[model samples]
Target: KVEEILEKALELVIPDEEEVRKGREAEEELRRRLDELGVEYVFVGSYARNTWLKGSLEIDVFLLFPEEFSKEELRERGLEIGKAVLDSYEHPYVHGVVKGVEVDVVPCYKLKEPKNIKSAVDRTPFHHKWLEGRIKGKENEVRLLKGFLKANGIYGAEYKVRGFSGYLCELLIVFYGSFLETVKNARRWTRRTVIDVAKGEVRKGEEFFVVDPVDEKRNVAANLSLDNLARFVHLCREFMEAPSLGFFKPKHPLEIEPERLRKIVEERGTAVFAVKFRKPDIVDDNLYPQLERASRKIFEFLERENFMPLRSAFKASEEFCYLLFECQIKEISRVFRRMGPQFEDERNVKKFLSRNRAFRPFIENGRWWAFEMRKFTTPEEGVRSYASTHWHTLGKNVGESIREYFEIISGEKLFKEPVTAELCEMMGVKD
Candidate 1:
């Protein structure tokens, strides 16, 4: 039964065979010259893993060159090689359309020290492997956990753990070394468990789960649905695992309530920022009105899926009156990276949300959808989501999703009311 569901979900996700064949063709043409150029080290970000395809989204290639070339030489060579790399392909890099798959190439030097150069391609080995392993693992875990959670529902039961993704639980097991050990290290785990591994002495199941993570509210006995609640349970399990994963579990346990977590999200301190924008005169009179019209026209687009626009002061700016929000920066970044440049500019927008070393809290469905709505607010802003399954492109994926969602929502709204001068001016739609 689970397999059937997953198969259907995959069918919904994966493009037709013809599209996949085209992606393969593009991949072959792109790599045709690597052997001739003597490029030895190459790490396929998400594309190599085959986790995502070109039509679903584009992919990035991390070509690691040797230290023989100087910085300037690397720069010039990168440009020349970039042109060559695209030339081998049948489609154009800028707006290529072959078999309905659009791709972009980002050429960069894999520096010895990532911190030394802001533009350098760099990441810790531990994080890279853990995420890559976990996401794929989670798909299986989700099936198991979904099955288990279904068996037990609506309040406390005989099982200690009811809600969890197979991947989430797998992460806990490997991360903490066992179910018992997982409890010991519960206090220290963060969003990225690999970071804990790097710090030494990963907290092994040594902490308590936040009963009410989003609002600090407590539930001694509350009803939960197998279908919807399964995801929430997964989130709660992660919150508990965070401490163990981070190696910072509190020695003593305290009672937590729902209101506690709710406040965090409301104040924009949690992963989901629930907000509303107060549009300025210029925006309401010009841009805001037009965006409403444009957004409606682009509904059902794969990139714009689940995106909507709302006016809010929390993210509104005088310059743009935009609604800026903060979520799990790490996840936002990964989504963009996985999507590659085809869907987005691949900006590191997570840096804006994650100025501190804080992690994102798990959000409810309503909060999750609310965030999606912001993605269509304007071309500059959009919704992005990332699962920390594959660390390699987690940041990029999250960042890109946020950007795409924002553009889709904003574009739809603007298109709906194109006659508005503010909307046309902002969209660069000259009449």
Candidate 2:
């Protein structure tokens, strides 16, 4: 019935000429302000293509700044620009019948020098060049991998790869250039150096590349393969492409330990540790087991949300514990209205919603708002409690959802039991 109604309304509800003109006006006004502030920016993603089909179209705006600016300065500028854009706009991208379009403003830094606005966006030159430069460049490789993932339904659709922004693709190209050198040396180093993990010393090569016992108790590379190493480089490529990626401190300053960093640099070519900890349960690594099915089912409750600095953790008692995440804020009504299923009672959900500090601004300002999912649990009635928790959040899907996502993406049901069989196969395990 709902689908029938939606089908009937589709032709009438489509965004028309007046609506399209207004969107352009809104973009121009916001762009003018950013330019006045001397901040550079570009239009991208869904809004650029005019293919967005939600009830409202979101104008995806990005405010680019030079990376040379201090972190604090960038944050301050972002907030200031955000405030100016939101307050100054006559429509302010309001939702509902009165206003249907939404704006999603984002930020990025220019990695290499750019000649024009087109170059700013089309900066994947390096990645394109790298693919050509390498003998076995695989530009379509990631696409195939993603297609496989989509076919299996492990990952969502093409648009959902949040971590793989255009900036990241550029960063990956640069990383390839840097990483190739590292992998080359790693091959040589593997032949000679006897890594003394217990003493945190490197013998037969030089002490410069010693693994600091405090940070790495063992040589993590020992467990990795060349392909695994390549995936690591790819992960860093994603992580550093985060608009805020550069803010994270390096493991060690170059001046503090140059040789150790050199080793790190070399390994960056093929190492995959950055991505190893990501959703570890999915592949059945030597590190950890899959969370039990009962526990896995509850993750279904995490729906789509935009609470920034988004996070999630698990807390299990002897009998039961909850998977949890604490964001800086969330929409209050949306929280309770959406969370009622888990709480099973509206009164309890509303009561819990009232206590959160994040709800205050929404309540006070008389504006719609949100709060974090403090915790979610599925209690086991029959069994004794356990303290098992998975320490990764690869978007909303995991456990069962992960399996489904893989299946949908890969276009094949993954795993006879779990994808452990496939993972083992990839690792060339023999009977």
Candidate 3:
């Protein structure tokens, strides 16, 4: 049953002969264009490796130039050539749709060895070279690992997902030999889990380190967050305990009926607030980090002001962005107790009381205390004030842009027209 299930799942994700042909044609077309421009380039990512899954129709082409060009010169000429090549097509990077697949033509410096790498991207070609011979027969295992990660919402090392990249997925299979073995090994992963396939030497420090074979000093899994790693570990244990086809199937948000959403909010008696703002005009790679930093800042600010946040998450689209917060209590105590020095410390006690007179100083358990009123009693009010006046304090990029234009929506108000369905999905509202 397990083999049958895996076979069916792999059949679904593995690119068919027709899709492979189109991808090759698309890649060749880009290479031909670069050749005409007299610019050297190479196909570096999934397409070159042939591990790309079905319907995964994106190509990565790296433009390589010699050491004579400075980094700035390389970027300038590279972008110029890319613009000329892309001509009528428009995109942020040198990107466009080709033969029904999205293509990204990036520029990087070519190095003779990994030691002479000029930029982070220059290391990619070395990675491709290292994996080419080792991963020849393990493409199926790579596909299975990638499908499992994607189904569990843990694929892609992009800033937004902070999970596994396609290359990282391939490397994992190479290290473990097969998908089932990889999961079984993951069960033994500790906080200091390190996989040095090349050196076979154990190292410490990182939460989960997968050393790059080409560059021993570099960790391939550096972008993967600790929480994502923990989740993957937990998922491995769960799947191994009782193997299920569900582990390989994609997950969807539970259907949240209108009544269910309302009932949960009312019964829980906690406030769920969202700060909405215009999404910055930037790619997700750059935008998501700023959004996450700002979200953490906001959550911290609420905690400092006595609003205990139970959980928080951030999401963004081209049109707008949202930072959602679920608080343990909608409103905090109106009176806040400020602690002062112990009564035995005469000078410190006097000084603390003098500074806190506005809060009405008092004595409690041989220590000095004061009762101060909170600035904002409710989560909605706190979020509104922060979003309106103090958002710039959140994060440099996120605050400056969002402070000027943002809205605070709370409770049932979140069930409004456009964002209603999305909110339910994000919050995982269930019947």
The number of the candidate with the highest lDDT is 3
* Candidate 1 lDDT score relative to the true structure: 0.34
Query: 1 or 3: which has the higher TM-score?
Result: 3
lDDT of 3 by residue, 1-431 (tens): 66777788787668888888888777777666667777777778787888887778677777676664444543444455443434211122365566666767665667777565445677888888888888998887888888888888899998878998887888888887888889998887877988888875456654678988887777788888888899899999998788778888877655666567778777777777788888777767878888888888889878877678876877786688888887877767788888888999999977887763455788888988888877778988888877777776767667877866888877566655245545565456654
What is candidate 2's lDDT per residue for 1-431, written digit by digit as tens?
A: 42343233333324567767667776676666667778765655334534332234556555454544333444444445443333212012211111244554444455464342323223433223333334134322222222222222232212212112322222222233332232223333433354443353456843222232223332323333333334434443443344121212222211313333334324432110100112433222211223333233233322222232122333222332223322232232323322222344566547656665644423323323345442422121001111223223323323333333221111011111133332223323334
Query: How many clashing residue pairs appear in each of the predictions shown?
Result: 114, 40, 0
- What is the RMSD of candidate 1? 22.9
Q: Which has the better lDDT: candidate 2, or candidate 3?
A: 3
Q: Arrange candidates by TM-score, descending.
A: 3, 1, 2
2 against 3, candidate with superior TM-score: 3
Worst 10 residues of 1 by lDDT: 334-343
TM-score of every prediction relative to native? 0.33, 0.27, 0.86
- Each candidate: what lDDT? 0.34, 0.34, 0.76
> In model 3, where do residues sit more than 4 Å from their true spots?
36-39, 68-93, 201-206, 339-360, 417-431
- The TM-score of candidate 1 is 0.33
The stretch of ten residues in a row with the least summed lDDT in candidate 2 is 269-278
The CA lDDT at 343 in model 2 is 40
- lDDT tens readout by residue for model 1, 136-224: 53333322223333333321222222334332344444444443344335334443222133233333322322222111232211222
